[PDB]
Every structure is written in structure tokens, then in C-alpha cells.
């Protein structure tokens, strides 16, 4: 089982300038709940964007994809191919744009948080993968964040 987990602006933007273009702390707990105790796979830039205090993410086997066969990532496993990254039965791909695209074909689950923020796609942005009709989804109710942003959760599956 390979799952993808991400948060996106309605527009599809998931990252800009090396960061996430919004604040939504309420998301942190759902992320933690889905990923805890499993192997998590991320691209090298996502690793670098993780704050030093939670790098590596505690309670998870952190796997980092990189084409630098010498890249240093303390507390994480550096692999150079996607096949090497996906050996665990329950693996959650947590980013970024490149890695989500690369892993989508292997995925049977996606936990998506939609953020109701006006943020048009700009050139160079990290973007969320587009789910076609092989996916059957379940949409949650909109909620308000203390940040002021409305957000909801989607759970997608495909056998
Ligand atoms: N909103 C959300 O839910 C999330 C948003 N993000 C955002 O995403 C952005 C980063 O995304 P993005 O720029 O797409 O980067 P990625 O995190 O996907 O990392 C890309 C890097 O992964 C490595 N890589 C990619 N493909 C391969 C491959 N096929 N084989 C080996 N190594 C590979 C390379 O490392 P190297 O260059 O070292 O070879 C490459 O530079 C940031 O802005 C981040 O904040 C991240 C996670 C979640």
C-alpha cells in the first residue's frame, strides 16, 4: 500500500519559494495521525524544508529520495531510486511536487486537505497531482482554521 498525503490550495498550489504558502496548524495532527508508525517517503527538497526540530519526523522511518549518492540526512534513509523507497507495506509519500508525481502510479490512497485560499498557480510553484477517474473519493465538511482559512479533507481510494 502506497499512499500520498498533501495539503493544497483549491488552485493546486502546494508550495512556493521552498515553503507552504499558508498556515494551517490543524493539519499537523491529521498528518501525524495518518503517517505515525509508518515509513514516510519524501523528495530531497521536502526534507530540507522540514524545520530542524522535526527533521527527521519522530516515530516514522524517514526515507529521502535524492540523485546525490552522498547526500547527508541524519536520522533518515537516503535512496536514489523510487523503487528503493517503496519497499514497506505501508508507505506514505509526503512530498514534494516531484515525488508526488513520481509516486502517484504506485498509490492506492490519497489523503488530501483542500485549503480555501485564493492563490493562483504561478510559474515554478510545487503543484499537487491531479486525480483522474480511477479514484473514488469521500469529501469531508468545510472547517474554519484559527488562521481564518476554510479547509476540508478528502479520502481517495483505488484498488
Ligand atoms: N503542501 C503540502 O502538503 C506539501 C508541500 N511541500 C512543498 O513542496 C516543495 C518541494 O517540492 P519539490 O520542489 O517538487 O521537491 P521534492 O520534495 O519533490 O524534491 C525533489 C528532489 O527529490 C529528488 N528526486 C526527485 N525525483 C527523483 C528521482 N526520480 N530519483 C532520485 N531523486 C529524485 C531530487 O533530489 P536532489 O536534487 O537532491 O537529487 C530532487 O531535487 C516545497 O516548496 C515544500 O514546502 C512539501 C510537502 C508537502
Swiss-Prot record:
Keywords: NADP, One-carbon metabolism, Oxidoreductase
Entry-linked CDD domains: DHFR (cd00209)
A GO molecular-function descriptor: NADP binding
Reactions catalysed according to its record: (6S)-5,6,7,8-tetrahydrofolate + NADP(+) = 7,8-dihydrofolate + NADPH + H(+)
Gene3D superfamilies: Dihydrofolate Reductase, subunit A (3.40.430.10)
EC number: 1.5.1.3
SUPFAM superfamilies tied to this protein: Dihydrofolate reductase-like (SSF53597)
PROSITE patterns xrefs: DHFR_1, DHFR_2
InterPro entries the record matches: DHFR, DHFR-like_dom_sf, DHFR_CS, DHFR_dom
Residues that bind substrate: 5-7, 27, 32, 60, 100, 113
Residues the record lists as binding NADP(+): 6-7, 14-19, 43-46, 65-68, 80, 94-99
Pfam entry (one): DHFR_1
Record function comment: Key enzyme in folate metabolism. Catalyzes an essential reaction for de novo glycine and purine synthesis, and for DNA precursor synthesis.
Family membership noted in the UniProt record: Belongs to the dihydrofolate reductase family.
Protein name: Dihydrofolate reductase
Amino acid at each position: 500500500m502506497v499512499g500520498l498525503i498533501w495539503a493544497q490550495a483549491t488552485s493546486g498550489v502546494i508550495g512556493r519559494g521552498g515553503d507552504i504558502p499558508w498556515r494551517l496548524p490543524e493539519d499537523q495532527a491529521h498528518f501525524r495521525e495518518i503517517t505515525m508508525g509508518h515509513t514516510i517517503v519524501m523528495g530531497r527538497r521536502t526534507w530540507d524544508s522540514l524545520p530542524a526540530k522535526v527533521r527527521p519526523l519522530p516515530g516514522r522511518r524517514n526515507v529521502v529520495l535524492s540523485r546525490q549518492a552522498d547526500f547527508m540526512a541524519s536520522g533518515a534513509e537516503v535512496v536514489g531510486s523510487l523503487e528503493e523507497a517503496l519497499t514497506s507495506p505501508e508507505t506514505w509519500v509526503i512530498g514534494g511536487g516531484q515525488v508526488y508525481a513520481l509516486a502517484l502510479p504506485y498509490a492506492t490512497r490519497c489523503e488530501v486537505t483542500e485549503v480555501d485560499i485564493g492563490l493562483p498557480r504561478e510559474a515554478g510553484d510545487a503543484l499537487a497531482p491531479v486525480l483522474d477517474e480511477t479514484w473514488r473519493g469521500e469529501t469531508g465538511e468545510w472547517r474554519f482554521s484559527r488562521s481564518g482559512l476554510r479547509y476540508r479533507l478528502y479520502s481517495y481510494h483505488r484498488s
